[PDB]
Amino acid sequence: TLLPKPPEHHPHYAFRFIDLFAGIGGIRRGFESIGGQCVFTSEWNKHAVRTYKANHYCDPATHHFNEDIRDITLSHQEGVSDEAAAEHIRQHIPEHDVLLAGFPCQPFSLAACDTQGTLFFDVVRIIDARRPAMFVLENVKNLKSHDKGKTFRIIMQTLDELGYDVADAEDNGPDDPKIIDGKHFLPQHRERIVLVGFRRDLNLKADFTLRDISECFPAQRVTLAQLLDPMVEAKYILTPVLWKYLYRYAKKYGMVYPNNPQSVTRTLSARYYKDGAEILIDRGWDMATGEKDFDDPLNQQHRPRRLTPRECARLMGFEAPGEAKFRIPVSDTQAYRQFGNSVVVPVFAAVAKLLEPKIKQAVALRQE
Numbered sequence: 522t523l524l525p526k527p528p529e530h531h532p533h534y535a536f537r538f539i540d541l542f543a544g545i546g547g548i549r550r551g552f553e554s555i556g557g558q559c560v561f562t563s564e565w566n567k568h569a570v571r572t573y574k575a576n577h578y579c580d581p582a583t584h585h586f587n588e589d590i591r592d593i594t595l596s597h598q599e600g601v602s603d604e605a606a607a608e609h610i611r612q613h614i615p616e617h618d619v620l621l622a623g624f625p626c627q628p629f630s631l632a633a634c635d636t637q638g639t640l641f642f643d644v645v646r647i648i649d650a651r652r653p654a655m656f657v658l659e660n661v662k663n664l665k666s667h668d669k670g671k672t673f674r675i676i677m678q679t680l681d682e683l684g685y686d687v688a689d690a691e692d693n694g695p696d697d698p699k700i701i702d703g704k705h706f707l708p709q710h711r712e713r714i715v716l717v718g719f720r721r722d723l724n725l726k727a728d729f730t731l732r733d734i735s736e737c738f739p740a741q742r743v744t745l746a747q748l749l750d751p752m753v754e755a756k757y758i759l760t761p762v763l764w765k766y767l768y769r770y771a772k773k774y775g776m777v778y779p780n781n782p783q784s785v786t787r788t789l790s791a792r793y794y795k796d797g798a799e800i801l802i803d804r805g806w807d808m809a810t811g812e813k814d815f816d817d818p819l820n821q822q823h824r825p826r827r828l829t830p831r832e833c834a835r836l837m838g839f840e841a842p843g844e845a846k847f848r849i850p851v852s853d854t855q856a857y858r859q860f861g862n863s864v865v866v867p868v869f870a871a872v873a874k875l876l877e878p879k880i881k882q883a884v885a886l887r888q889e
Contacts, residue, residue: 551869703865838866
């Protein structure tokens with residue numbers, strides 16, 4: 522069928538990992554690519570879960586799903602001590618070598634109790650309960666400046682107190698290696714912060730730094746044009762009414778010209794579903810004629826278009842140039858939301874590459 526298929530090295534895997542707030546599998550794809558086995562996944566969005574399952578091999582004998590992480594950590598339940606919560610977590614989440622989480626950005630309004638009331642607390646409770654050798658957390662580019670630096674400070678203190686060393690923890694200047702831009706791999710602007718932790722007692726970090734991420738860049742970055750399909754359906758062209766709205770608005774959208782091989786799109790946002798405004802593909806519009814007379818019949822044959830879901834899946838790294846392997850079982854609007862909420866896959870394939878030898882050390886340590 523169209524059911525996802527196991528990798529070549531199945532049923533023998535190099536390491537085990539879990540996948541928290543997984544969305545549609547972005548971080549997971551990097552780690553699979555070095556032989557990892559996902560043994561647990563957590564994601565609240567049902568449409569996202571649908572896409573995830575159509576695209577990743579999930580054997581119910583060695584893997585399971587959770588929707589609401591609190592049902593496992595019991596963080597919304599009083600009278601449950603830390604140790605009983607920990608024991609309950611271990612019933613649902615198996616031992617793993619690497620923990621992956623894209624938690625969202627929340628203030629610690631209640632300020633390991635400074636973090637209560639946020640998903641980060643659920644993440645930290647799971648880390649305590651299962652002591653993975655390594656973790657990788659993913660978050661907004663401006664984590665350091667959020668809520669006047671309170672949020673980042675608390676996050677870094679809590680990670681340190683768990684007994685983890687975070688990669689490049691002491692470099693928080695304007696050059697922070699923790700901030701990684703997807704634009705070095707794919708033609709889209711997209712900075713995110715990446716927190717890679719190593720359990721201190723394994724003494725694994727050694728000389729690891731994210732500065733080395735540059736060694737993973739492609740010699741030649743694929744251009745935007747190469748990510749585009751030849752014929753696109755008519756529905757992706759903007760309606761007369763929306764184009765004029767957007768165009769007037771900009772006089773008191775981000776256009777991309779694909780014939781310019783250097784062009785880099787704006788971030789594909791969660792907002793993208795609304796109109797496509799941030800990334801419009803030019804189709805021969807003549808700016809002089811539009812300013813001369815906006816409804817000109819020939820010029821009106823050349824309104825810009827939206828990206829298609831297939832083109833979003835390429836721009837995030839879920840799908841190769843010229844290919845159509847990524848199954849999109851949701852409406853266009855649902856696909857735009859999910860792509861605008863993911864991480865850029867090759868960013869995390871690269872982080873996984875820099876980790877692969879460490880993870881091997883870690884597996885070998887515990888196999889003793």
